[PDB]
Amino acid sequence: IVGGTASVRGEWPWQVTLHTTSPTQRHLCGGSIIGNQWILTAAHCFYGVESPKILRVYSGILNQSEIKEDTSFFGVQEIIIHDQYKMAESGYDIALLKLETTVGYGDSQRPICLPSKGDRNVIYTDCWVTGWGYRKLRDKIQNTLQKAKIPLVTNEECQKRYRGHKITHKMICAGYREGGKDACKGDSGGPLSCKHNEVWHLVGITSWGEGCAQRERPGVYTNVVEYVDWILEKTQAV
Numbered sequence: 001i002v003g004g005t006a007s008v009r010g011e012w013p014w015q016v017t018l019h020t021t022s023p024t025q026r027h028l029c030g031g032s033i034i035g036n037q038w039i040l041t042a043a044h045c046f047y048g049v050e051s052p053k054i055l056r057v058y059s060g061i062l063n064q065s066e067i068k069e070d071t072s073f074f075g076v077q078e079i080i081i082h083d084q085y086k087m088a089e090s091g092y093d094i095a096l097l098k099l100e101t102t103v104g105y106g107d108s109q110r111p112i113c114l115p116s117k118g119d120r121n122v123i124y125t126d127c128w129v130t131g132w133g134y135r136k137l138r139d140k141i142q143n144t145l146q147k148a149k150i151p152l153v154t155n156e157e158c159q160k161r162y163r164g165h166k167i168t169h170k171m172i173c174a175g176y177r178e179g180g181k182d183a184c185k186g187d188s189g190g191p192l193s194c195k196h197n198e199v200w201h202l203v204g205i206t207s208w209g210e211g212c213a214q215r216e217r218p219g220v221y222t223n224v225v226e227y228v229d230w231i232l233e234k235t236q237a238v
């Protein structure tokens with residue numbers, strides 16, 4: 001996260017850190033708890049991941065230093081990538097992780113509500129991007145979960161900023177015209193959380209941008225409301 005500040009413990013209890021074990025253990029991506037065995041994240045996080053056996057999901061983490069060999073995690077039973085996904089820049093950048101065991105909800109780990117279809121028309125004014133990603137283009141994974149408040153940008157304005165790309169309504173953009181606050185390397189897969197009527201909603205999934213926090217280059221997020229039926233298809237299968 002560029003231009004953000006330290007989160008307080010329990011502030012974003014749906015935020016997870018997804019680690020890979022191959023070749024060595026490191027933070028791979030962010031994710032959000034959406035159900036007691038479900039993590040919503042970005043499809044591009046699994047580039048080159050040949051098996052769910054190398055993945056570890058840690059919930060209830062503020063600091064990466066809380067993670068040692070003796071720290072409990074959730075194993076991943078299955079990786080579900082949207083089958084229209086080709087690359088982050090073309091959209092469908094969405095994946096579900098089905099966990100091997102159930103998350104016990106509490107004040108340190110709980111789900112974020114998905115947006116309602118009836119709320120496609122609501123204007124969100126209180127949106128935050130979170131993660132342990134870089135604070136600048138060449139940096140390192142941050143110990144403390146960072147947060148940054150960022151305004152949503154219309155599809156028309158985002159398309160103007162990304163000449164040469166096709167910004168679809170399945171994407172949602174966020175950023176200041178002058179830049180300064182954004183997601184960066186290591187934040188992808190994490191949430192873009194917006195508070196509406198005292199309820200937090202998972203509005204976006206951190207996906208891509210041209211550099212980080214650049215003037216007139218908003219962050220591009222998967223527009224979660226456009227995938228609610230796909231999430232229900234995969235999580236509510238009979």
Ligand SMILES: COC(=O)Nc1ccc2c(c1)NC(=O)C[C@@H](C)CCC[C@H](NC(=O)/C=C/c1cc(Cl)ccc1-n1cnnn1)c1nc-2c[nH]1
Pocket residue numbers: 026027028029044045046047133140141182183184185186187188206207208209210211212213218219220221
């Ligand atoms: C010690 O541990 C570490 O250092 N871990 C460690 C360290 C770094 C990374 C990873 C692990 N993850 C990967 O490389 C997985 C691999 C498939 C994922 C590729 C892509 C991923 N992109 C982002 O996270 C965000 C992009 C992004 C999104 C928005 Cl909305 C705006 C600007 C963005 N940027 C444009 N340019 N940079 N950012 C990424 N993540 C990293 C580099 N790049």
